[PDB]
Design an enzyme around this catalytic site. Structure first.
Site, mmCIF file in Angstrom:
data_model
loop_
_atom_site.group_PDB
_atom_site.id
_atom_site.type_symbol
_atom_site.label_atom_id
_atom_site.label_comp_id
_atom_site.label_asym_id
_atom_site.label_seq_id
_atom_site.Cartn_x
_atom_site.Cartn_y
_atom_site.Cartn_z
ATOM 1 N N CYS A 1 1.220 -9.581 -7.338
ATOM 2 C CA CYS A 1 0.211 -8.525 -7.157
ATOM 3 C C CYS A 1 -1.022 -8.639 -8.064
ATOM 4 O O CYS A 1 -2.044 -8.083 -7.725
ATOM 5 C CB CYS A 1 0.839 -7.112 -7.204
ATOM 6 S SG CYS A 1 1.348 -6.514 -8.806
ATOM 7 N N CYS B 1 13.207 -10.894 -24.004
ATOM 8 C CA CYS B 1 13.492 -10.964 -22.562
ATOM 9 C C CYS B 1 12.508 -11.975 -21.919
ATOM 10 O O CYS B 1 11.287 -11.813 -21.961
ATOM 11 C CB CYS B 1 13.450 -9.592 -21.818
ATOM 12 S SG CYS B 1 14.857 -8.415 -21.807
ATOM 13 N N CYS C 1 6.756 -18.912 -17.793
ATOM 14 C CA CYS C 1 6.205 -19.883 -16.813
ATOM 15 C C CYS C 1 5.781 -19.261 -15.489
ATOM 16 O O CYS C 1 5.328 -19.954 -14.625
ATOM 17 C CB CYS C 1 7.221 -21.002 -16.561
ATOM 18 S SG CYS C 1 8.724 -20.451 -15.777
HETATM 19 ZN ZN LIG Z 1 3.567 -7.285 -8.862
HETATM 20 ZN ZN LIG Z 2 10.082 -19.864 -17.428
#
Ligand SMILES: [Zn+2]
Ligand SMILES: [Zn+2]
Ligand SMILES: [Zn+2]
Ligand SMILES: [Zn+2]
Ligand SMILES: [Zn+2]
Length: 192
Positions: free
Chosen positions: A16, A23, A39
Site C-alpha cells: 500500500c 521483530c 528486506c
Molecule cells: Zn499495506
Molecule cells: Zn528479510
C-alpha cells in the site's frame, strides 16, 4: 558518516505504500500485508507460502536474501566490521544510554557497551547492517565453505560437492563465484 543517516531513518509498506515508523516481520495496519522489515519480502502465514520448493510451509516465515538483517543480525559485530573494513567503509565504534529515538518519541536509553559507539548492542548492529546494505556489500565474501554450501542449497536448490582434486580453497572460490553470479543481493533493500 552514515551513523547520522541511521538515526534520521521510516518504514513503508511495499504493497500500500503507507509510511509507518513503528521483530523482523511487520503487520501493515492499512492493508494487513505482512512483510520483513529488513528486506520487504512477504511473510507467509501457515500455510500460504506459494513457493513450491519450500520445506518450511507450515510455519510463519518469509524468504530473505543473504544480506537481510534477518540473517546479518546473527553475525557478531566483529564479523560485520570485517566486511565493512574489507570494502573500505568507515564505521564508528565510539560516539562522535542508547541514543536511538523510538516512537513509544523517546530514546532507547538502554546500556551502551564499549565499542558500540553510543548505542545498545542490538541498535549498533542495525547500524552496521544499515551500512552494509547502503553500500551493497556482499556477505558471502566472508563465508566459510559450509556457509557457502548452505547458501547454495538455500538459494539454488542444489547440494554442492567438491570436484575431484579440488582443494578447499578452489571449492570455496567456485561456490562463491556461482553464488554471486546467479543470486542477487536483496532486490528491495534501499541502497545508496
Ligand atoms: Zn499495506
Ligand atoms: Zn528479510
Ligand atoms: Zn506477527
Ligand atoms: Zn516459503
Ligand atoms: Zn538502543
Amino acid at each position: 558518516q552514515g551513523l547520522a543517516m541511521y538515526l534520521q531513518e521510516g518504514i513503508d509498506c511495499p504493497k500500500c505504500k503507507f509510511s509507518y515508523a513503528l521483530c523482523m516481520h511487520f503487520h501493515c495496519t492499512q492493508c494487513r500485508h505482512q512483510f520483513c522489515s529488513g528486506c520487504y519480502n512477504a511473510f507467509y502465514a501457515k500455510n500460504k507460502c506459494p513457493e513450491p520448493n519450500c520445506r518450511v510451509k507450515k510455519s510463519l516465515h518469509g524468504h530473505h536474501p543473504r544480506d537481510c538483517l534477518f540473517y546479518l543480525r546473527d553475525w557478531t559485530a566483529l564479523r560485520l566490521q570485517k566486511l565493512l573494513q574489507d570494502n573500505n567503509v568507515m564505521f564508528n565504534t565510539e560516539p562522535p544510554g542508547c541514543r536511538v529515538i523510538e516512537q513509544k518519541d523517546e530514546a532507547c536509553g538502554k546500556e551502551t557497551p564499549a565499542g558500540y559507539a553510543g548505542l545498545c548492542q542490538a541498535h549498533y548492529k542495525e547500524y552496521l547492517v544499515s551500512l552494509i546494505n547502503a553500500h551493497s556489500l556482499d556477505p558471502a565474501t566472508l563465508y566459510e565453505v559450509e556457509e557457502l554450501e548452505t547458501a547454495t542449497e538455500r538459494y539454488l536448490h542444489v547440494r554442492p560437492q567438491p570436484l575431484a582434486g579440488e582443494d578447499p580453497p578452489a571449492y570455496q572460490a567456485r561456490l562463491l563465484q556461482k553464488l554471486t553470479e546467479e543470486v542477487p543481493l536483496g532486490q528491495s533493500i534501499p541502497r545508496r
